[PDB]
Amino acid sequence: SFETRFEKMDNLLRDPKSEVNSDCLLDGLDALVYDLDFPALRKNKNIDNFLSRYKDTINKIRDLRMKAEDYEVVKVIGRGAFGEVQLVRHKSTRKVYAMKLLSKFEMIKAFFWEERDIMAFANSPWVVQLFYAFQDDRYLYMVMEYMPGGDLVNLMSNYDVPEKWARFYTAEVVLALDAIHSMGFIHRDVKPDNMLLDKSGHLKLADFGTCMKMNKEGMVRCDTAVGTPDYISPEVLKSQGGDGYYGRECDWWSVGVFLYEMLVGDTPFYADSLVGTYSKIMNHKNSLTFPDDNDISKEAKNLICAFLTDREVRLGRNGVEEIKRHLFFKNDQWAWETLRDTVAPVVPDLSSDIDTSNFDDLETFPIPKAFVGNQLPFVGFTYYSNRRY
Amino acid sequence: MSFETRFEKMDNLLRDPKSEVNSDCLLDGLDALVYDLDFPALRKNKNIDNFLSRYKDTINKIRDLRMKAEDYEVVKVIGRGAFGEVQLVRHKSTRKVYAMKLLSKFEMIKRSDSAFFWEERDIMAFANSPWVVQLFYAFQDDRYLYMVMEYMPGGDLVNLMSNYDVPEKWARFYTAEVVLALDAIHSMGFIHRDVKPDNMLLDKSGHLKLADFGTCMKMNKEGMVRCDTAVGTPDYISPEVLKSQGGDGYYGRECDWWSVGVFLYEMLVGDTPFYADSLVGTYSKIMNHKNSLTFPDDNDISKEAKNLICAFLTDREVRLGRNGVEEIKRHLFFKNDQWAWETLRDTVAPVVPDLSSDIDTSNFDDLGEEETFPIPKAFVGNQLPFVGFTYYSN
Numbered sequence: 001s002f003e004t005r006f007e008k009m010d011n012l013l014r015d016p017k018s019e020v021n022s023d024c025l026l027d028g029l030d031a032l033v034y035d036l037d038f039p040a041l042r043k044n045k046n047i048d049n050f051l052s053r054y055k056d057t058i059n060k061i062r063d064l065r066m067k068a069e070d071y072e073v074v075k076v077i078g079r080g081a082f083g084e085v086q087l088v089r090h091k092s093t094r095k096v097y098a099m100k101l102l103s104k105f106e107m108i109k110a111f112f113w114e115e116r117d118i119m120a121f122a123n124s125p126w127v128v129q130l131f132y133a134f135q136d137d138r139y140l141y142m143v144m145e146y147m148p149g150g151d152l153v154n155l156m157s158n159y160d161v162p163e164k165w166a167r168f169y170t171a172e173v174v175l176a177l178d179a180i181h182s183m184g185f186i187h188r189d190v191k192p193d194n195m196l197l198d199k200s201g202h203l204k205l206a207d208f209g210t211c212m213k214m215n216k217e218g219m220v221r222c223d224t225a226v227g228t229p230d231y232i233s234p235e236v237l238k239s240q241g242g243d244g245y246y247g248r249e250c251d252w253w254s255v256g257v258f259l260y261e262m263l264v265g266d267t268p269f270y271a272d273s274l275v276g277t278y279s280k281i282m283n284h285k286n287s288l289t290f291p292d293d294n295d296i297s298k299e300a301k302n303l304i305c306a307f308l309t310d311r312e313v314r315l316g317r318n319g320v321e322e323i324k325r326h327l328f329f330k331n332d333q334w335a336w337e338t339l340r341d342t343v344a345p346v347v348p349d350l351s352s353d354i355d356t357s358n359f360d361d362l363e364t365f366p367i368p369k370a371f372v373g374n375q376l377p378f379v380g381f382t383y384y385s386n387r388r389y
Numbered sequence: 390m391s392f393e394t395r396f397e398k399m400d401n402l403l404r405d406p407k408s409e410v411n412s413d414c415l416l417d418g419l420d421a422l423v424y425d426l427d428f429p430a431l432r433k434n435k436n437i438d439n440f441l442s443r444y445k446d447t448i449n450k451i452r453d454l455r456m457k458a459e460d461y462e463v464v465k466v467i468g469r470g471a472f473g474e475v476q477l478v479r480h481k482s483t484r485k486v487y488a489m490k491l492l493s494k495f496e497m498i499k500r501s502d503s504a505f506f507w508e509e510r511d512i513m514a515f516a517n518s519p520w521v522v523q524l525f526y527a528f529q530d531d532r533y534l535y536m537v538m539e540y541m542p543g544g545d546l547v548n549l550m551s552n553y554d555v556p557e558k559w560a561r562f563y564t565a566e567v568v569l570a571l572d573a574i575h576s577m578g579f580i581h582r583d584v585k586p587d588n589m590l591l592d593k594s595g596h597l598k599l600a601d602f603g604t605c606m607k608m609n610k611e612g613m614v615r616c617d618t619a620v621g622t623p624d625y626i627s628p629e630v631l632k633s634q635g636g637d638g639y640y641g642r643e644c645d646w647w648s649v650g651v652f653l654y655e656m657l658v659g660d661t662p663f664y665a666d667s668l669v670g671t672y673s674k675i676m677n678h679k680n681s682l683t684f685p686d687d688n689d690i691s692k693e694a695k696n697l698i699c700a701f702l703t704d705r706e707v708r709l710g711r712n713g714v715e716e717i718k719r720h721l722f723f724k725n726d727q728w729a730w731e732t733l734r735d736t737v738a739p740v741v742p743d744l745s746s747d748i749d750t751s752n753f754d755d756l757g758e759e760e761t762f763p764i765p766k767a768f769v770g771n772q773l774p775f776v777g778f779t780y781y782s783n
């Protein structure tokens with residue numbers, strides 16, 4: 001019917017997950033105007049007359065919609081290959097956020113889609129939340145909840161982690177990874193840098209740029225290795241054309257590396273050179289050893305070894321319940337179902353909403369001769385006008 | 390302002406039918422991008438190829454769901470013009486009858502002149518006047534612009550004038566309606582510039598409505614307009630609009646009043662006051678209106694009608710209507726006991742259409758391959774001058 005067509009079209013515009021929602025449509029127009037406003041293209045009357053018609057409107061839209069100048073940047077609290085994470089305060093609302101910038105220029109010389117989705121729609125206390133996502137001609141912005149407690153790298157460097165704390169943080173990582181796995185993704189880059197603590201000391205996973213959606217069998221088909229030298233599993237490291245098919249058990253190997261790091265003070269496959277670490281991972285059967293220091297319990301050594309094995313015999317091949325039932329998690333202080341309501345080993349002592357005590361002190365595209373469309377791969381990234389409430 | 394105020398202003402901008410960024414204009418922007426980019430030569434660019442692949446499924450759905458030409462059953466072609474045709478249509482689903490004007494995008498680019506339809510779309514969509522032909526929907530495809538308007542079953546004034554030797558009482562009625570109709574357009578801030586009987590349509594009751602707003606221009610702060618464009622057939626064009634050839638002079642609403650004088654003369658005399666065998670001859674006679682305007686020596690035209698024709702057919706500076714409509718309205722030619730200006734459209738029209746159905750075309754006379762744009766080697770943006778043309782009434 002006429003009304004059915006009208007209504008199907010209306011739902012396609014409102015839907016927070018639609019490709020033709022208002023956010024995408026405004027992105028589509030903003031991208032057209034960015035890609036066309038160059039003197040060489042303006043020689044074309046179709047382009048020049050179009051830009052002149054939409055001049056006033058594009059300036060209004062740009063002023064009204066979310067932009068970087070809406071945020072007061074307090075401190076740069078993180079860095080990465082394609083940008084930075086900055087502690088911001090939204091000038092108007094006075095609300096405090098962590099804002100991740102991704103260089104459009106650098107990305108050009110697709111990963112952010114799943115990272116945007118996981119953070120925006122997880123609705124999990126274990127996943128860092130995405131409130132807004134916007135963009136300009138130079139960057140992509142992800143306005144997330146600020147994690148004042150810092151990461152696990154910072155914790156590990158300030159404390160000799162006892163087993164009772166290690167048990168807590170491992171248990172939270174396990175629940176956090178199971179939450180991502182249930183959403184249908186493998187993290188593929190589990191490391192203490194990606195484990196953040198909130199104002200109460202409880203964990204949340206961050207950095208979903210390596211996330212990949214599992215198939216019907218719960219596998220991922222990849223030809224290129226992905227992750228970090230120290231925490232990468234043997235099957236992800238050697239992943240190729242012929243082979244390169246793996247599941248959620250690659251994230252469980254990384255939990256074993258993490259537990260070892262916390263209790264031992266070093267990563268299990270540390271070497272003088274990065275290439276030496278690759279060699280030690282591949283030879284985990286002979287290279288995994290424990291120092292002759294009576295501190296690590298029988299149960300902790302067993303968990304580390306149950307995870308730090310070949311995929312086929314790895315703990316977690318039969319799901320989370322076999323991890324959860326491990327003797328290392330046997331304690332009389334918490335239960336799996338209630339864990340995030342318990343009092344954390346380290347409760348952050350914070351002075352303000354912009355306290356950065358857990359955070360250490362920290363070009364673009366040429367002028368196109370012809371239409372290049374550098375803004376086209378980022379159309380629909382905006383999360384503002386059509387958010388899920 | 391506040392965060393919520395900014396959020397809400399942006400939201401209302403997306404729903405506003407007067408907005409350049411509402412959903413239909415934004416969907417036009419995307420549909421135009423995909424039309425202009427889907428060529429093998431541009432698809433060599435990964436940004437373009439990946440974008441088109443991502444939006445492939447969506448663009449097909451949107452194209453299928455949105456209003457399109459195949460939604461309309463075309464009954465008869467009832468009009469023709471430089472850039473297309475006016476066809477009597479019935480919307481297949483709703484079963485409602487409309488007149489649909491098609492404007493060729495190929496022709497509008499070939500001949501330049503691809504910006505006239507904006508003021509025509511706005512006037513018809515937003516006039517909300519019994520004197521202005523209404524626009525219900527405006528849509529488009531890679532080749533055409535469509536304007537779905539109210540059908541005017543009574544035909545135009547050219548048809549009437551050709552079937553009757555118009556008496557003064559009818560001429561008074563039709564002139565009075567044209568005057569009220571033009572005043573309505575003027576109040577919206579536009580000068581018509583092409584007032585002619587072809588543009589005066591009659592509805593099912595015999596009352597007038599102006600059509601064809603393709604020459605309309607928005608008046609500035611001082612109520613003036615400036616142009617350089619070609620003047621297609623000069624019989625009704627005023628000396629100012631003709632003197633204004635190539636950015637010469639600024640003129641006001643009094644150019645439409647001159648055309649009313651030409652119209653009144655045509656109705657009572659049977660011929661246009663400045664007719665000539667050639668276009669250039671008509672231009673000469675208009676410019677020399679002081680000596681070329683004459684009346685036939687037959688007492689048929691009243692003192693008052695000759696006075697109105699002459700009050701309008703003079704130089705702008707002394708033209709009736711220089712001090713507004715009230716001086717036109719108060720003219721002795723309009724003095725009658727049959728109607729009042731305020732009530733005129735409620736009176737019984739001189740000629741009431743006798744119609745057999747909702748698709749009766751008795752007042753419409755019965756009525757070549759379509760050239761297409763070549764395959765672009767580089768981005769040309771042929772769909773960009775039509776972004777935002779789409780409009781739907783609620």
Ligand SMILES: CN1CCN(CCCOc2cccc(CC(=O)Nc3nc(-c4c[nH]c5ncccc45)cs3)c2)CC1
Nearest residue numbers: 079080081082083084098111144145146147206207209
């Ligand atoms: C598969 N490919 C994808 C692209 N990959 C390039 C790295 C992406 O580039 C970044 C730019 C800036 C920062 C980062 C690190 C990062 O992801 N940081 C994050 N921080 C948070 C965060 C949320 N709330 C916070 N509160 C305090 C501190 C940090 C945060 C979420 S993700 C990466 C390489 C692997």
Ligand SMILES: CN1CCN(CCCOc2cccc(CC(=O)Nc3nc(-c4c[nH]c5ncccc45)cs3)c2)CC1
Nearest residue numbers: 469470471472473474488505538539540541600601603
């Ligand atoms: C200098 N530039 C100015 C713009 N110029 C464009 C010519 C317009 O191209 C046409 C295409 C097809 C038809 C027409 C004539 C026309 O405007 N007819 C109209 N009919 C109606 C109409 C509404 N309801 C009706 N009911 C019955 C019959 C007709 C109608 C509205 S406009 C023009 C080119 C030169």
